[PDB]
């Protein structure tokens, strides 16, 4: 537990790691320390709701070495444990390196004095800081007022602990209910769905919308999505508003505003996240408003020596202005930029951060820009071929983390445009891959189009 560190990375996820790899690649003798309230070393989140549930390895719970869609085993951790130095040797070890203090939470940030306070009473000072604290899962108020009995049977899925505890539960109970129609929630619907078919148990997913991912996707693709979830065996209940939750003889009882009742053994909440601006009080960088997250400049700074990246960061988006994102690609790229800037410097974050989600090897979505379903939307669909699924894409690139394969620079499948007037502000790509460069160039040009079809042809529709 060092008293001082040149580079402090608060929080131990994907942003923090992207930063540290970058710094070491630009200053091969830099001394970087990550503080992580997670017992685990830094690891990626997408598999937690994806491949990890699809493997046939009974040890997959223990090793968290998962198989991608193409068959290649990969670890959920960014680096083997042997690549990090000790927080102890960090201050003096020849060449320095990267160190992670696991199980420790930074609770106080004294910006003026360049110092942090850990939970245990430790005090650490820094020359250069990155806040990469990600977010905290939201619950629903209709859960929180039910007491400690219901709360103890409500997974808020986010971490390895949640994967492990929920995987266990899928082998012990008869009925699991997912609240939330969002991507995570639907990924979790399919994944638990697949385990429940093997066991003969029940999976229920509910949400207020008309269909899955209803805030993002138009009715057609949303309703289709819902039918896909139902094909996995899931009892999907749309237009479900939660009235209250309570104990009813060993079972959880969900009462809806539309009157319906649902008996289930366990709940998994997947209703989004709230940024972690905690240290935003004692620090006096104290966040934005419209969008949530710490305010940063073009180079991702909240102060002259304190950058922010990843989920915690409210950045200026090249085409969309102020924005907050929950994308892994954002994490990696803004994390990488932030680390480059900490090693001096002077580089704007002009990146258009792609989002992607897979519901199994066979269905994949990819978003870029403002993708809200309330906008004017134009969809152009087609019959998908042999290479038009995540399994093929993962076979083509060798990686199942889409952001690595689809590059950073500029009815089975289809493309949905989102419009303010006739300007493309957002795009969804349904089962179409290798076309994010064109997808970016289209939004970045901010052009006006009175067709939509000719554009669609570049996606190979
Ligand atoms: C289950 C799941 C599946 C996902 N799938 C996808 C996907 O398919 N595609 C996609 O684009 N995105 C996906 N995402 C979102 C994506 O993973 C996030 O954008 C990414 O994790 C952001 O990284 P981060 O560094 O901002 O936050 P995190 O990875 O959460 O890292 C923050 C870490 O810092 C810790 N921390 C917070 N505060 C403190 C403190 N004061 N002191 C010490 N530590 C602290 C937290 O415990 C956490 O471990 C998924 C997310 C989840 C949760």
Swiss-Prot record:
- EC number(s): the record gives 1.6.99.-
Which positions are annotated as binding NAD(+) 1? 181-184, 209, 215, 272, 326-327, 356
Which class of enzymes does this protein belong to? oxidoreductase
Q: What is the effect of changing residue 348 to L?
A: In DFNX5; uncertain significance
Annotated effect of mutating residue 327 to A: Allows dimerization in absence of NADH
Q: Quickly give the catalysed reaction.
A: A + NADH + H(+) = AH2 + NAD(+)
Q: Where does NAD(+) 2 bind?
A: 69, 366, 434
A single Gene Ontology molecular function, please?
Answer: poly-ADP-D-ribose binding
Disease per record is:
Combined oxidative phosphorylation deficiency 6: A mitochondrial disease resulting in a neurodegenerative disorder characterized by psychomotor delay, hypotonia, areflexia, muscle weakness and wasting. Some patients manifest prenatal ventriculomegaly and severe postnatal encephalomyopathy. Charcot-Marie-Tooth disease, X-linked recessive, 4, with or without cerebellar ataxia: A neuromuscular disorder characterized by progressive sensorimotor axonal neuropathy, distal sensory impairment, difficulty walking due to peripheral neuropathy and/or cerebellar ataxia, and deafness due to auditory neuropathy. Additional features include cognitive impairment, cerebellar atrophy, dysarthria, abnormal extraocular movements, tremor, dysmetria and spasticity. The age at onset ranges from infancy to young adulthood.
Query: What protein am I looking at?
Result: Apoptosis-inducing factor 1, mitochondrial
Organism, by scientific name, is Homo sapiens (Human)
The major lineage groups are:
Eukaryota, Metazoa, Chordata, Craniata, Vertebrata
Full protein: residues contained: 128 to 610 of 613
